[PDB]
Motif scaffolding. Structure first.
Motif, PDB file in Angstrom:
ATOM      1  N   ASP A 109     -10.937   5.344 -11.519  1.00 13.51           N
ATOM      2  CA  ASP A 109     -10.854   5.197 -10.146  1.00 13.51           C
ATOM      3  C   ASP A 109     -10.510   3.705  -9.683  1.00 13.51           C
ATOM      4  O   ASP A 109     -10.920   2.792  -9.387  1.00 13.51           O
TER       5      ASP A 109
ATOM      6  N   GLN B 115      -9.704   2.964  -6.758  1.00 17.79           N
ATOM      7  CA  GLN B 115     -10.000   2.787  -5.368  1.00 17.79           C
ATOM      8  C   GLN B 115     -11.149   2.304  -5.108  1.00 17.79           C
ATOM      9  O   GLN B 115     -11.291   1.229  -3.859  1.00 17.79           O
TER      10      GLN B 115
ATOM     11  N   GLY C  69      -5.271   0.248  -4.613  1.00 19.55           N
ATOM     12  CA  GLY C  69      -5.939  -0.657  -5.387  1.00 19.55           C
ATOM     13  C   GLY C  69      -5.570  -0.628  -6.660  1.00 19.55           C
ATOM     14  O   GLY C  69      -5.916  -1.018  -7.885  1.00 19.55           O
TER      15      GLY C  69
ATOM     16  N   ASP D   5       1.046  -0.986  -0.072  1.00 18.39           N
ATOM     17  CA  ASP D   5       0.382  -0.083  -0.187  1.00 18.39           C
ATOM     18  C   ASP D   5       0.983   1.004  -0.225  1.00 18.39           C
ATOM     19  O   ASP D   5       1.468   1.369   0.549  1.00 18.39           O
TER      20      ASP D   5
ATOM     21  N   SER E 146      -0.958   3.547  -4.996  1.00 17.75           N
ATOM     22  CA  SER E 146      -2.168   2.960  -3.622  1.00 17.75           C
ATOM     23  C   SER E 146      -2.588   1.549  -4.055  1.00 17.75           C
ATOM     24  O   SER E 146      -2.926   1.568  -4.816  1.00 17.75           O
TER      25      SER E 146
ATOM     26  N   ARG F 268     -12.720  -1.042  -1.354  1.00 17.07           N
ATOM     27  CA  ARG F 268     -14.086  -0.159  -1.762  1.00 17.07           C
ATOM     28  C   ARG F 268     -15.130  -1.401  -0.740  1.00 17.07           C
ATOM     29  O   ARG F 268     -14.761  -2.563  -1.448  1.00 17.07           O
TER      30      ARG F 268
END
Ligand SMILES: [Cl-]
Ligand SMILES: [Cl-]
Ligand code: NA
Ligand code: NA
Length: 129
Positions: free
Chosen positions: A119, A121, A26, A18, A24, A125
């Motif tokens: 996106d 992320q 994701g 991470d 990141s 989620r």
């Protein structure tokens, strides 16, 4: 082993991915989805005779030794079969070397074409992290 989305996110987080080199979590989960469909046993052969191995489809021309890719380096100093384990440690440690070599995550074609600029992320989620 075929991972679940949140199961893999948690495993990658525990192994230090991470925000590794600024990417990141994701991003890593998205790359694994489209490289291997979260299957540690995935293999695919390339036109040049090299083969890609494991959840992040690491290639035998540069990064691991499979005994059948002439003129290859083994820059991660590992047999390619170690990348197919249910334990992702060897894949993660090698990916850290790859992503540090200058081109970031653009080394993974599926990340460039299907994750970059999206996106990412959304891939984590709902997960308990
Ligand atoms: Cl993310
Ligand atoms: Cl692609
Ligand atoms: Na899961
Ligand atoms: Na090699």
């Amino acid at each position: 082993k075929v991972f679940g989305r949140c199961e893999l996110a948690a495993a990658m987080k525990r192994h230090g991915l991470d925000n590794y080199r600024g990417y990141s979590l994701g991003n890593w989960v998205c790359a694994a989805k489209f490289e291997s469909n979260f299957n540690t046993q995935a293999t695919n052969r390339n036109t040049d005779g090299s083969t890609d191995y494991g959840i992040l489809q690491i290639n035998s021309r540069w990064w691991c030794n499979d005994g059948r890719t002439p003129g290859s380096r083994n820059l991660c100093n590992i047999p390619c079969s170690a990348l197919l384990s249910s334990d992702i440690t060897a894949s993660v440690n090698c990916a850290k070397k790859i992503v540090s070599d200058g081109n970031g995550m653009n080394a993974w074609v599926a990340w460039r074409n299907r994750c970059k600029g999206t996106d990412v992320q959304a891939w984590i989620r709902g997960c308990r992290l």
